């Protein structure tokens, strides 16, 4: 109860006996010194700094630093504060927010009873390369080659739209517009989200490169947008499309990595329309390897605010779209990601809000709608209510945009964005 | 009489409670910015952008700082500014959550004759009612006038004035 920085080598010689810190009186200084001492010790040891409950400034700053270290993966397993015992609510809150002891694909590993706490765990050696084989085999029908980079762009193959694939997608999405109608002697085109389902195989190859890696279990869909070309009609059922995009800057974030995708659409050689996609992958990496012209508004003019319902069984909806996310089907793959449950897909849940916006504004007409952007903030679980909303945004040379807002059950923003119609 | 100015200790707590669905009593000053958000990725990014646009001075760690440390450090740099994002949220509540007839000029003039508050305490009374506004909106002039009388007594604990 006098030394502080002398436990850098005493706890790594077998077991931690009476390792305390009575000289570390700094708030942010004590948290940075504890992380550097764990890297110089053995891999698989236990540490544990004791807080000072005698001072009010040390007890308040030490309680906030202990909560952030437990969620990142530290070796702190014991914390015995001084100045006697705490209160009835102070001691009970530390055991629920921090996992301490007391106070006062493939799944095979070689077991070895010589560490102490755990026998054998999953090693981090080639963790991103081994887990990428299960995600690339559920969409891409070729060999695994990590020779790509973010500075270059390459397009895949081309699949033409058929009448058999468009008929099964209309009953699973639930849209009775002019494009998803069944009538004889009438040319039926495709919707705004119909062409993005066939072209999603080439835009989901963002983790195919060796430099754009990350956590594959937490790589969920961040956002997805779409926009038509200037003066172009909608594609029917007979023409193919192509998509080719990359990441210019370092697509990263403060809690992981990001992904910048912008697919396109072809129509017999010439361009048809465009699209956009975004993915949020957790992790910790920092290596990379004119004026105001927007529209405004005068008052909040609302359109409609109806309610919807998510699908309880996503087995027939994900099969017609070709989603590469296999953690939203079976319950075995969802346990490794530590999520709240079997949530819906990013491109499947956003297609219901985009198709319902034209039915309450344009009376279900695909000739006036040109752009559709929906950014999913949170995740929506299956078999739940979805409160939709719409509001007037701005005009774009005769095309008045419409906003969108999808709330959860507890009035939580899970998805938002704004579309473009006329 | 002694009108309280638009300090950063009460303006920052009311703006963060409206985006996270909370009130002034639930958002304590001893908590942190990241501990009171819940831990969501979408709620953490929106809380950092709303605090810097309403204050101006952007610090190093806006989420790791506590509520009593971030609001006290921004009070010395702010001189009662209306803000870019704070002015748009206060004007929209007078038209959506309230009825037609009680604008920003009618709400500030009522506090000088029924409570004795000038332009300094007029912004603090309207900011406390927007963070704890109910789901039922007003539809007449009598509903908006009743909320101004109740706000002078509930928000008097942070200013120190009588009726």
Author numbering:
A (entry chain G): 601 to 704, 1236 to 1420, 1526 to 1658
B (entry chain A): 140 to 302
What are the paper's exact sentences on this?
Enzymes responsible for synthesis of the lipid precursor palmitate, a 16-carbon chain hydrocarbon molecule, are collectively known as fatty acid synthases (FAS) and are conserved from bacteria to humans. On the other hand, type I FAS, found in actinobacteria and eukaryotes, is an ‘associated system’ where all essential enzymes are expressed by one or two genes and organized into a large, multi-functional assembly line. Substrate and reaction intermediates are shuttled between catalytic centers via a flexibly tethered acyl carrier protein (ACP) domain. In fungi, one or two genes encode all the essential catalytic domains and additional segments that serve as structural domains, stabilizing the assembly into a barrel shaped D3 symmetric dodecamer of ~2.6 megadalton in size.
To our surprise, inactivation of FAS at DH in the presence of substrates resulted in strong cryoEM densities in proximity to the catalytic cavities of the DH domains. Iterative refinement with D3 symmetry applied resulted in a 4.4 Å resolution map of the mutant FAS with improved density for ACP at the stalled DH site. We used the cryoEM density of the truncated model at 15 Å as the initial reference for 3D classification, which was limited to five 3D classes. This resulted in one class with strong ACP density for the shuttling domain that represented ~35% of the symmetry-expanded particle images. Local refinement demonstrated a global resolution of 5.8 Å. The quality of the ACP density was sufficient to allow confident fitting of six out of eight α-helices of the ACP including all four α-helices of the catalytic lobe. Therefore, the observed ACP position is in range for catalysis by the DH domain. The N and C termini of ACP face away from the reaction cavity of the DH domain. This model indicates that both the structural and the canonical lobes of ACP form transient contacts with the chamber scaffold with primarily polar and charged residues lining the interface. Further focused 3D classification in Relion 3.0 on this occupied class demonstrated the conformational heterogeneity of ACP docked at the stalled DH site representing a wobbling motion of the ACP between the ER and the DH domains. The interaction interface of ACP with the DH domain covers a larger surface area and involves multiple structural elements contributed by both the DH and the ER domains. Therefore, when one of the DH sites is occupied by an ACP domain the adjacent ER of the same β-chain protomer is blocked for optimal ACP binding by the other two shuttling domains within the reaction chamber.
